[PDB]
Amino acid sequence: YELTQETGVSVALGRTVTITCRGDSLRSHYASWYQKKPGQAPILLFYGKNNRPSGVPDRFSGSASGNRASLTISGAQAEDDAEYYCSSRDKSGSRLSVFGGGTKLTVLSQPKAAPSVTLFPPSSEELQANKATLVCLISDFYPGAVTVAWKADSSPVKAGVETTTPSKQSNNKYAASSYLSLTPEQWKSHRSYSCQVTHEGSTVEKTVAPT
Amino acid sequence: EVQLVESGGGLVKPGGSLRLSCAASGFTFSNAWMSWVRQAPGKGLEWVGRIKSKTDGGTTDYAAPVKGRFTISRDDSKNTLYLQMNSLKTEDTAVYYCARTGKYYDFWSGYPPGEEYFQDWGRGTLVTVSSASTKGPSVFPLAPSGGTAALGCLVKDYFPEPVTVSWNSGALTSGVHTFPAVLQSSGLYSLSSVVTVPSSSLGTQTYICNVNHKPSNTKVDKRVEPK
Ligand SMILES: [Zn+2]
Ligand SMILES: [Zn+2]
Classify domain B132-227 by CATH number: 2.60.40.10
Neighbours of A127 (CB within 10 A): 18
Question: Distance (Å, rounded) from C-alpha B49 to C-alpha B94?
Answer: 15
Q: Distance between terminal CA atoms of chain A?
A: 38
For chain B, the structural domain boundaries read 1-131, 132-227
What value, to the nearest 5°, has the Cα angle with vertex A75 and ends A114 and A62?
100
Dihedral sign, Cα of residue A60, residue A61, residue A62, residue A64: negative
Overall size of chain B counted in residues: 227
Experiment used for this model? X-ray
A42/B119 Cβ within 8 A = no
Assign a CATH topology to domain B1-131. Answer: Immunoglobulin-like (2.60.40)
Q: Is residue A52 located within the same domain as residue A126? A: no
| Final resolution, Å | 1.6
Q: Is residue A165 located within the same domain as residue A211? A: yes
How close, in Å, is residue B180 to chain A by CA atoms? 7
Say if residue A209 is exposed, middle or buried (CB neighbours under 10 Å; 0-12, 13-18, 19+).
exposed
Q: Is residue A54 located within the same domain as residue A117? A: no
- CATH code of the domain containing A133: 2.60.40.10
Neighbours of B207 (CB within 10 A): 22
Chain A residues with CB-CB distance to B154 below 8 A: 120, 123, 126, 133, 135
C-alpha gyration radius of chain B: 24
B179/A177 Cβ within 8 A = yes
Chain A residues with CB-CB distance to B120 below 8 A: 41, 44
A167/B180 Cβ within 8 A = yes
Question: Distance (Å, rounded) from C-alpha A80 to C-alpha B1?
Answer: 22
Neighbours of B43 (CB within 10 A): 11
C-alpha gyration radius of chain A: 20
B184/A164 Cβ within 8 A = no
Alpha-carbon torsion angle B60, B64, B68, B70, nearest 10? -60
B43/A135 Cβ within 8 A = no
Strands A97-99 and A68-74 come out as unpaired
Closest CA relative to residue A134, chosen from A58, A50, A207: A207
Considering every ligand atom shown, identify the ligand nearest to the alpha carbon of residue A198 and give its number: 2
Q: How far, in Å, are A18, A33, A64, B109 from residue A5 at the CA level?
A: 11, 12, 14, 26
Question: Distance (Å, rounded) from C-alpha B101 to C-alpha B52?
Answer: 9
What value, to the nearest 5°, has the Cα angle with vertex B95 and ends B92 and B101?
105
Q: Distance between terminal CA atoms of chain B?
A: 62
Omega before residue A143 within 30° of 0, cis = yes
Alpha-carbon torsion angle A103, A104, A107, A113, nearest 10? -120
Pick the residue of A28, A33, A65, A123 with the most B CBs within 10 A to test the interface with B by mutation: A123
Q: Is residue A85 located within the same domain as residue A119? A: no
DSSP string, chain A: --SEE-SEEEE-TT-EEEEEEE-GGGGT---EEEEE-TTS--EEEEETTTB--TTS-TTEEEEEETTEEEEEEES--GGG-EEEEEEEE-TT--S-EEE---EEEEE--S--BPPEEEEEPPPHHHHHTT-EEEEEEEEEEBSS--EEEEEETTEEE-TTEEEPPPEE-TTS-EEEEEEEEE-HHHHHHSS-EEEEEEETTEEEEEEE---
Say if residue B99 is exposed, middle or buried (CB neighbours under 10 Å; 0-12, 13-18, 19+).
buried
Total count of domains within chain A = 2
